[PDB]
RNA sequence: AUAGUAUAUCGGUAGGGGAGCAUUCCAGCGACGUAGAAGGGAAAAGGGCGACUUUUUCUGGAGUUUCUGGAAAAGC
RNA sequence: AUUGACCGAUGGAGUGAGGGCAUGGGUGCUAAGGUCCAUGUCCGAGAGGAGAAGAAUCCGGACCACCGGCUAAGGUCCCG
RNA sequence: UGAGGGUAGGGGUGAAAGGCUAAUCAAACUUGGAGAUAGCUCGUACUCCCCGAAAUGCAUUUAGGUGCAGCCUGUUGGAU
RNA sequence: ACUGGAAAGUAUGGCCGAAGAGCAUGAAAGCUGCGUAUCCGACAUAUCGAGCACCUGAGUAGCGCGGGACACGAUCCUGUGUGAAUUGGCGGGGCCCAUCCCGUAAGGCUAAAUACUCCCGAGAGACCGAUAGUGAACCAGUACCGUGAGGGAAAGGUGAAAAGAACCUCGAAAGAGGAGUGCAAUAGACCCUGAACCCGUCUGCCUACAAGCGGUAGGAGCGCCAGGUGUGACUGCGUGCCUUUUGCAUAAUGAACCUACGAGUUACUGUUUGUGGCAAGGUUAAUUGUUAAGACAAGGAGCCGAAGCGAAAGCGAGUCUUAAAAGGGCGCCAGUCACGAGCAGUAGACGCGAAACCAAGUGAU
RNA sequence: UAAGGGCAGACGGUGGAUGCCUAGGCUCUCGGAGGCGAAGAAGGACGUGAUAAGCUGCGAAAAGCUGCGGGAAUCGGCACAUACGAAUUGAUCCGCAGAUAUCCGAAUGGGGCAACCCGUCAGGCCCCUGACACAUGAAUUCAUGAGCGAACGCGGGGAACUGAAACAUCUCAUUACCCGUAGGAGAAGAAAACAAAAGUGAUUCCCUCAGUAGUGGCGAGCGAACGGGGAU
């Protein structure tokens, strides 16, 4: 109500008119006044102990370990970006068809750019794996060097 | 923002070990001989607020 | 597997809303009663009120004064020093009841007489009851205020 | 977001108004009238369902007090007749006797009288 | 509600407590649609009970939606 | 003997305009559908039956259904 | 009586009626403080289930408001 | 290839991808168009030593009287009246004095870390979708109202494409019936869909001896399509709803009707509770690093728990009261961080509604 | 039987809800920038087309004029129709630099009821008409300023409703509001400082300290600093 554009002035006497009692144009009774209770911008963030966060990243993992949905591949670099090259990797771990997320362990600006084209594939670093980005994917591919990283990471 | 606490009440009460409100008697500032000795002591010691008060004393300390 | 989320037992809950009809249990006045200042829009309690009757925070006395060079010292007991030791000792000091978590840096100690202290240490705390002093001396131990 | 229940809050005022129509007036097709007559007529539903077994009852009495009354015996002799033999026929049952097949009600009279 | 089917209990204003339905949008697993989506008219059938849901047919001519979880501009 | 009806701690209230009747009273005029207390009760927040039609008089506490049966107060010439 | 000037809101002007000051006057109009305050009146929207009051006492610049007690309800522990 | 008015759909079989973001095209397009990933480009213009006692800020510091600012109803500022010293000096450390400590007034200048959005460029949204969202999607501070300051609307959609209906019939011509275009004209210009209140025509049943909130429970006959549906002769029972009340058919309040709109919300600080993590410990805040806002790792400052009693000095599973004791009072004999929920306070705080108060302007047509 | 009436259904009328849609909003993030004007601004008046109400662009050179770079077949704005033209000797269109730019408005030659009237002075045409200059104030003819415009800064003045369940101290609040005046930021800033025998050394901003010490018709309320952790 203190928002809108009409001016606070007393549209009609209090007594004597012979309808309803009336105040300023904004009044949200009226056709085009204020909107009550509304929106009103936030910020939804909230916390979580830090110890809670190590313990769900630790059971999605088990999950996927339990549902046997864990691929372990030899680490490999492209020469190019190509997204032809990627797809058989996709098509060779007989992962393609599904979710799949990558983990890898460093850059590899060229790998990055051969799978980003691809619908369905996903990249990530070992070491912002998140509860979410594992539970998202049918199917875990690890490399053989981010094993290391996550077994002293998360630990 | 804040809870902000009575200025008069933290003034006059205290909070002991197992969570009571300490507190003084009144009648004891200045018509003094006509009363007994008994009742002067009595009103000499501090006390406890009642359960049924303990409700608004918490609120003026802020639950404290 | 976030097609498949779920809760505790007993963890989330619906709120309660208010003036949305009678089936509810909760329309008309809205839990409010019929009238009167509590029933009004804005209604909010005076703290110290009591209904113009003087108030307690008033028909009490003020009492007592605060001191601007207090000491305040942590009390740490017998029964812990001879805990703390064999669990990790024979020396106790201030640094390292501060390492192992049981005072913080910059706060002061005093040993009391809750417990026992049997092993024979030498202690270094700031200040020492007369009856904790005299447990570790019984006990061929070494008291150094410090 | 916005939400606005346009379809579902039209719905149940149509639902209802089918339930309605036969009325006089404006009680058929006017919503505020309409749903107030239809609340009203929801009320006299439930007594009238008690009053249903009290007034098939006494059209049951009025009939045998009829049928006995042709063989000599009001219907308060006859009642006291038949619990003293224990016949535990009800008076549904002996009403219709006594209409559509008079020679059964005429024999439980006889095994009375 | 108690005991694990038995016993008891079930009129209600202010008011306290429990359990649900619909609406808008989001995540996930998935479906439907010019061989006819939403909306609008008619009819039939369901629900311990209900808020409501489902099916058929006419109009209509392009979008709609199950379940699990999440958030509200969430019902006259 | 008693379906458990009592109490403590702690979260949330509403209420703080009452009313009729019977009994014991004050006041009033041994007036008032008056007024002020006490003890029960009912209406308030209570439908059903009798009283022609009546908030609290008499009978009686409605989970839902039934075109079954027995009774209460009160009735049984006709409307009934 | 015409034209053009002048006096502006606790101010003006008044052969004085609290009259008049743009159909408004015991303090004009417009915008802002501003959603002033209102112990007051009116209004408060889907469903089913369990329980279920009070209209008293004390105090009050109090008496149609409120604080505490009394009476309801959730959870929890005791028997009463 | 099929369906279709029209494939971009569906079913086969291919191909590109550092490009599977998007918008448009007669339906939903990585391969039709504009684009996207990536790479390459400016004639202009714009921007990036000893001694010595010489000096070290005057109507100033300080003070009286009256005010103001400091969290504050010793310190700082001054309207009025006065008024020092000089390094062995001067000022401060919350009246004041002594000692000690800290510092050098009455001259000046300085980036960063902070505040904001008329605007330009690039983006986004568990934000709105035409009574919403800006007052303003169109024409908008417009039309309109006022002497003036000022106040201040309503109003989007044919169709893929105008192919926007040549010509005939009735009419003086308005309007229609045809024809034609088109997937569709009941898409024909106020044109997508096309609800209610309200208004007609037709068909079926009932109705001119009958009297009350208009229904409800029974119940023949008749009309339609195998027991469903429309109607309802006759009978029983029945004084609307809301709000306010001790109590309302009340002749107490309130509404013409419909469609649309319309009233416990959010933030922060507590407290209780349901569910979790860790546990004699629990937890980070600001902020920082890596990667590309998020994510992951740091950040222990601080906060709560861990000992109480006493006004306090202080003693301590004790302490206070006492000259001491006994007695007596208060203590001794699993927390913490979150998530959901109830409640409280501060914010307009469930919504609408005064008479009024104050400030700056506009008015003597 | 039906002058008429009741109910149901079918088909229509009216009206414009609903569904679907978007051309416009709303809240922000990141980067830049933070002015225009006497060499005449912001904002206006009047004009300007083959045709021309209104918008848009433009200014008597008037939907426009000249170069340079780009680009390649259409073009003469919204915006039609008709009419006449332009353009592969490169039109339209885009970027950059120029030319022109009436009247009012700080308005500044004097007046004035804005968009009008009346002059002096020097030149050139012929009762008139061109094209120059001519305000004021603060510095030394010359140089400068004035006015307009978001928020943020710093100064000068400064309420009341409201809360205290009345009200005067107090609160609302060193707020609203009025006025003056900067910059891309501003203000502050290098100890006549804090501290407490232990130490830190300019200013600013964030997290704590802490609703604490205090203050207060000791009512309603108000409310630090030291110390520690950061940015820089
Ligand atoms: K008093
Ligand atoms: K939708
Ligand atoms: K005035
Ligand atoms: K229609
Ligand atoms: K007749
Ligand atoms: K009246
Ligand atoms: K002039
Ligand atoms: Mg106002
Ligand atoms: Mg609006
Ligand atoms: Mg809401
Ligand atoms: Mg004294
Ligand atoms: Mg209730
Ligand atoms: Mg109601
Ligand atoms: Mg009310
Ligand atoms: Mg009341
Ligand atoms: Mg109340
Ligand atoms: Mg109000
Ligand atoms: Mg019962
Ligand atoms: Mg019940
Ligand atoms: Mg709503
Ligand atoms: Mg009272
Ligand atoms: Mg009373
Ligand atoms: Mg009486
Ligand atoms: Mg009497
Ligand atoms: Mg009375
Ligand atoms: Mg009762
Ligand atoms: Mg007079
Ligand atoms: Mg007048
Ligand atoms: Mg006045
Ligand atoms: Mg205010
Ligand atoms: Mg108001
Ligand atoms: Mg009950
Ligand atoms: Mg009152
Ligand atoms: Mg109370
Ligand atoms: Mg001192
Ligand atoms: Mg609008
Ligand atoms: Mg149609
Ligand atoms: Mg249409
Ligand atoms: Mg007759
Ligand atoms: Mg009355
Ligand atoms: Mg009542
Ligand atoms: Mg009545
Ligand atoms: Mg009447
Ligand atoms: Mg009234
Ligand atoms: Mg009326
Ligand atoms: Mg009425
Ligand atoms: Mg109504
Ligand atoms: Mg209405
Ligand atoms: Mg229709
Ligand atoms: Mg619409
Ligand atoms: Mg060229
Ligand atoms: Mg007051
Ligand atoms: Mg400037
Ligand atoms: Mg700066
Ligand atoms: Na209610
Ligand atoms: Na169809
Ligand atoms: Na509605
Ligand atoms: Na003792
Ligand atoms: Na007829
Ligand atoms: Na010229």
Redesign the interface.
């Known amino acids: 109500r203190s928002e809108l554009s009409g001016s606070t002035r007393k549209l009609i006497r209090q007594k004597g008119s012979g309808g309803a009692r009336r105040g300023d144009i904004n009044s949200p009774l009226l056709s085009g006044g204020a909107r009550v209770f509304g929106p009103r911008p936030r910020n939804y963030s909230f916390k979580l102990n830090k110890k809670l966060k190590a313990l769900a990243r630790r059971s999605?993992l088990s999950?996927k370990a339990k549902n046997n949905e864990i691929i372990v591949v030899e680490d490999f670099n492209f020469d190019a970006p190509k997204t032809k090259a990627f797809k058989a990797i996709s098509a060779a771990l007989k992962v393609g068809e599904k979710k799949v997320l990558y983990v890898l362990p460093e850059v590899n600006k060229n790998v990055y750019l051969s799978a980003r084209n691809l619908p369905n594939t996903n990249l990530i670093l070992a070491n912002l794996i998140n509860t979410?980005t594992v539970?998202?994917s049918k199917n875990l591919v690890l490399t053989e060097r981010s094993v290391a990283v996550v077994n002293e990471l998360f630990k | 923002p804040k809870l902000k606490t009575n200025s008069g009440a933290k003034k006059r009460f205290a909070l002991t070990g197992t969570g009571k409100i300490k507190r003084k008697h009144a009648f004891k500032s200045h018509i003094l001989t006509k009363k007994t000795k008994k009742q002067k002591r009595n009103l000499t010691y501090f006390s406890t607020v009642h359960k049924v008060d303990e409700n608004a004393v918490k609120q003026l300390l802020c639950l404290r | 597997?976030?097609s498949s989320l779920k809760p505790a037992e007993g963890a989330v809950k619906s709120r309660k809303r208010i003036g949305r009809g009678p089936g509810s249990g909760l329309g008309g006045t809205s839990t409010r009663g019929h009238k009167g200042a509590k029933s009004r829009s804005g209604y909010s309690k005076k703290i110290g009120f009591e209904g113009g009757q003087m108030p307690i925070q008033r028909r009490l006395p003020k009492f007592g004064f605060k001191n601007i060079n207090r000491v305040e010292y942590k009390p740490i007991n017998l029964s812990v020093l001879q805990t703390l030791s064999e669990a990790n000792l024979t020396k106790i000091s201030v640094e390292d009841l501060i390492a192992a978590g049981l005072v913080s840096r910059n706060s002061l100690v005093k040993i009391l007489a809750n417990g026992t202290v049997t092993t024979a240490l030498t202690v270094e705390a700031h200040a020492f009851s007369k009856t904790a002093e005299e447990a570790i001396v019984r006990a061929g131990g070494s008291v150094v205020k410090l | 977001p916005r939400s606005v229940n346009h379809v579902a809050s039209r719905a149940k005022r149509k639902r209802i108004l089918k339930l309605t129509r036969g009325y006089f007036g404006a009680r058929k097709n006017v919503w505020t009238v309409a749903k107030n007559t239809w609340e009203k007529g929801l009320t006299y539903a439930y007594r009238d369902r008690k009053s249903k077994k009290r007034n098939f009852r006494a059209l049951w009495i009025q009939r045998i007090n009829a049928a006995a009354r042709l063989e000599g015996m009001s219907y308060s002799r006859l009642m006291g007749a038949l619990h003293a033999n224990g016949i535990e026929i009800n008076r549904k049952v002996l009403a219709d006797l006594a209409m559509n097949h008079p020679e059964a009600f005429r024999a439980i009279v006889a095994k009375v009288k």
């Open positions: 999605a999950y979410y539970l998202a | 597997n976030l």
